[PDB]
């Protein structure tokens, strides 16, 4: 069962290493978030390696997918942590870093934080299961490709199609009349709505990266590498977001 494998390979929670004794400025909160994103990205790479079917894809494509989807994976996992631990009342970045209204303001990311909070409120509305969540996160790893496609497009499409089949079989376990088509479309709609929020997070990311020292915001090595590669490709329009339902 691929879904049961997904449940067991889900990375363990990591601490942000947040310093509450230091002034709660935008530079210190953002630097803590960046440090946390760095650690979580190492976890994402180790998770992707043991993901069923991911090793079939060539190395270049595996890198491409991780680099295009990183923000989508981190934000989706944030929404899940927020839903599981606080019933989506707060943004649960880590056990030592839980954002309330004050931290959403101090981080200079209020509107972005509210946008993420809306996604977590959808988890409450839908009563999203862990089974669904784990399949959806794999679909997010496979939801952004280069405009001119991957080195092995057919291998990628076969992997993505199979995880779409997994999500469809999983929604049958949560029926209304006994129908599940409604839940499946609510899940694909929620997946599509990640692209727009992630487009805004990436815009904030890219700005803070271009002006990091002027803003006193630190970036770990993992992020420097990901962003230096992704910033030119995304801004040049070389990214192709994959939607279940075209806008």
């Amino acid at each position: 069962s691929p879904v049961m494998v997904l449940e067991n390979i889900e990375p363990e929670i990591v601490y942000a290493g947040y310093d509450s004794s230091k002034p709660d400025t935008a530079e210190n909160l953002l630097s803590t978030l960046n440090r946390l994103a760095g650690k979580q990205m190492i976890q994402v790479v180790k998770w992707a390696k043991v993901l069923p079917g991911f090793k079939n894809l060539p190395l270049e494509d595996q890198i491409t997918l991780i680099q295009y989807s990183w923000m989508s994976l981190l934000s989706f996992a944030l929404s899940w942590r927020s839903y599981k631990h606080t019933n989506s009342q707060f943004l649960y970045f880590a056990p030592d870093l839980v954002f309330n209204e004050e931290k959403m303001h101090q981080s200079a990311m209020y509107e972005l934080c509210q946008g993420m909070h809306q996604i977590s409120l959808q988890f409450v509305r839908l009563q999203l299961t862990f089974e669904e969540y784990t399949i959806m996160k794999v679909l997010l790893l496979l939801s952004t490709i280069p405009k001119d496609g991957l080195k092995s497009q057919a291998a990628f499409e076969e992997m993505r199609t199979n995880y779409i089949k997994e999500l469809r079989k999983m929604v049958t376990k949560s029926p209304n009349s006994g129908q599940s088509w409604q839940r499946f479309y609510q899940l694909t709609k929620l997946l599509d709505s990640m692209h727009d929020l992630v487009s805004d997070l990436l815009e904030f990311c890219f700005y803070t990266f271009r002006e990091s020292h002027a803003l006193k915001v630190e970036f770990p090595a993992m992020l420097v590498e990901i962003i230096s590669d992704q910033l030119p490709k995304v801004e040049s329009g070389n990214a192709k977001p994959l939607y279940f339902h075209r806008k």
Binding site: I42, V45, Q62, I63, E225
Partner: peptide, 10 residues
């Protein structure tokens, strides 16, 4: 070798 390349191949 990049950090992503190192982690994926190790």
């Amino acid at each position: 070798k990049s950090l992503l390349q190192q982690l994926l191949t190790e």
